[PDB]
Symmetry: D2
Subunit: 250 residues, 4 copies
């Protein structure tokens, strides 16, 4: 019951980290809408967690600005006022800054940065001043703290989310909106996508990358998000929560 | 049951933040030893939370090196192998660096830095390689991230705890000790000690200090510590968890 | 002679911080191209510093991608191979995240983020592997470290520049390109634009903002940039250089 | 002439980084006292740089509190009012936190932390309010930002110096003392001591440690210190200057 009465939107909630967030949110009493681009994947995902009284799928691209106010409307029609937004949708490009095409740059930032902006802006507008204990959780990454030579655009996007989220936190706090904004920074997490890339998990598990010598699992990110969505974290805003197996500590 | 089977030492556990940590740890199924310097205060504190099957007081000064191995022994005799160490004992001096006497400097660092060292060193030795999901939680502060002109020695101590804890995290991770080490960084928290200092809460509540416009409460720190003691945070090590009402975000 | 033989592009070099960078670069022996959007302003600016053997103006909007390869060509025709890129062009919007229009968001990021990307990408391509002691200096801000509730899009842009620059630094270092990339983070700096905004300097000079109790001057930023452009800083890459009167220290 | 009229104390100035700081300070017009524990080493060092009109050696252990006011007196008798303090003396212990003896802990912190405290406190007292453009430069390390599993006590000391220095910066700024305080954070630097440790330079030069693929040289640290001692950096206080070949960027 740690999220009793909460109503959450989890973007990119049909796979991996987002799916586990949705799963644990439902376990703790939240009602959840998960979004993703692909209907079959999303319908399967929602039903794996529960019925439509607690979780529903909505097809939506986080870069699709006009769809964001309809996503809130759909969620509120189902479950009542939204209390919790998890901006987790994202894509990656494996290119150095030097090698990044302008098309790649723009495509990644449209999802990873503009999408988070859209969800944060709308979340503040739709949740402020309602006594909801509202919480916006923006998914950055270890790549919001340190560079990676092969993730130039991705680093730009995660650094942007990191600091934009502080701006939003501060404005909400100063205006007594009853909305908190925080960032979560996963290290490497095992998912089917990582499993599809030969040698990725082993590279990420080297001690010079992850000191624990293995990578994490989606529930590792889910539980920090439960904390941040709950009223347990009512004094936490503007902060960065790193769950990375020691990656950034060395 | 989030801390089912855990056995925790909480130093400075008889007052304020430490007491609330102990309280929520017991609520979540841990057995707890709280320490403090004053018997009447500690006995009262323990009994306010529960009986001796779940919480006991041990009189101990965290600067007292020889008492630390006896504290572990006392805890283990009561409750079995220690799994969780919260190094929370600390003192403060209201002096600029310029105005700090060498006696003040040494006294504060003996508690705030040497005490954390003692507890961390011994915790690693006594908890490693036992499959306990062991967790050391070192209490830093917002004053481990930013300076305060009137807290020179206190800033030195909290910066030291911040980075020493990363060293310990990394060594434990690299050696597969099954011990995690993390730091918690409270902002201003309302306690009886703050209440005794006329004008302190209002000064700390100004928006230029705490953007939320009020200070926190001890349970705000307790709940992040429950997360960090639990197996929910098994991929978090070497990281800094800030609960400060936005203080460090601006 | 600290920049003897260097050839620099300084974007937004016709005003304020950029102009002072150009001025001190010329003083230390560099040849400089300054860019800006307005011809009268730029021609005046260049001639205030020196003749066309040491400084020239090129009209260019940093968001204008196709103009960037012609800017390098123009600079090299004048002065020989470019060694130093200062990505300083930028704009600001005074809006919270909540209040930012999508048009404002896109306009600011086109200059502040895409422009820095363009200059960094091209700088690496055009300066690598030539033995030039090449240096890319990306202008972030104190708003790349901390939020400001009224600068949402600006914060996103500066956080992005901060971390993207580390990616670029690392790729250049790992590949032995002989290109360094670093960020500079000015605090508040007195300029004619600040002078035009009634009450701005006094607001920025309050101790709760800038602990020194006054704001800086453009030369304060110029001298850190001279260090970073020079071979004196040949071991500095991937780092953040903060010149802010103490703003971020509290 | 970048340090014309400055009078500097450089602790641990007889070897390595400290010696190069002293060398470049003299080159730029400063008068310098270098300290160290060993007379033959210090006398040789001073004379290698210049005569007694510009550089002198004083035997002093930075942990020796009573010697610090006599060091200032000796310096002022020679050269007039001290303007610049570089707290560079330090020792290292190669032990994990777990393996650190209390004697090792205390010995290292007596030099690395107490010595910096002594020099900072006295520097503020002796240089404030004199119109000197005074500057205190505290030598931290990359080990003030990230952990190293084999440098537990050293990490504690450098984290402490990092944040204590911000306290001192802020107090000086708020009181208009005309004293700035900043930290310098070298990465790995080649010295005779590193050369004496078989395999150290190669270990430190691996790309997973230093992305540039080689370590630095003492002059790399000297030039950032010249910037910080000069009036060029009159708006820089409370900040961290990292010269590390990319170590902390990844």
């Amino acid at each position: 019951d740690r999220l009793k009465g909460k109503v959450a939107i989890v973007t990119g909630g049909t796979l991996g980290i987002g799916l586990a967030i949705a799963d644990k949110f439902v376990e703790e009493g939240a009602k959840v809408v998960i979004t993703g681009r692909h209907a079959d994947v999303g319908e399967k995902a929602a039903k794996s967690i529960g019925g439509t009284d607690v979780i529903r799928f909505v097809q939506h691209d986080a870069s699709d600005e006009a769809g964001w106010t309809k996503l809130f409307d759909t969620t509120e029609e189902a479950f009542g006022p939204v209390t919790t937004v998890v901006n987790n949708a994202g894509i990656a490009v494996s290119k150095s800054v030097e090698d990044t095409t302008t098309e790649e740059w723009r495509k990644l930032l449209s999802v990873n940065l503009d999408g988070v902006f859209f969800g944060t802006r709308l979340g503040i507008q739709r949740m402020k001043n309602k006594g909801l204990g509202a919480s916006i959780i923006n998914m950055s990454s270890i790549e919001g703290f340190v560079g990676d030579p092969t993730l130039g655009a991705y680093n730009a996007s995660k650094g942007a989310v990191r600091i934009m989220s502080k701006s939003a936190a501060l404005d909400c706090a100063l205006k007594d909106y009853d909305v908190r904004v925080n960032t979560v920074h996963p290290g490497y997490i095992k998912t089917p996508l990582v499993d599809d890339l030969e040698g990725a998990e082993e590279m990420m598990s080297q001690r010079t990358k992850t000191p624990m010598g293995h990578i994490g699992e989606p529930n590792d990110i889910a539980w920090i998000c439960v904390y941040l969505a709950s009223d347990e974290s009512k004094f936490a805003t503007g902060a960065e929560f790193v769950v990375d197996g020691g990656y950034t500590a060395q």
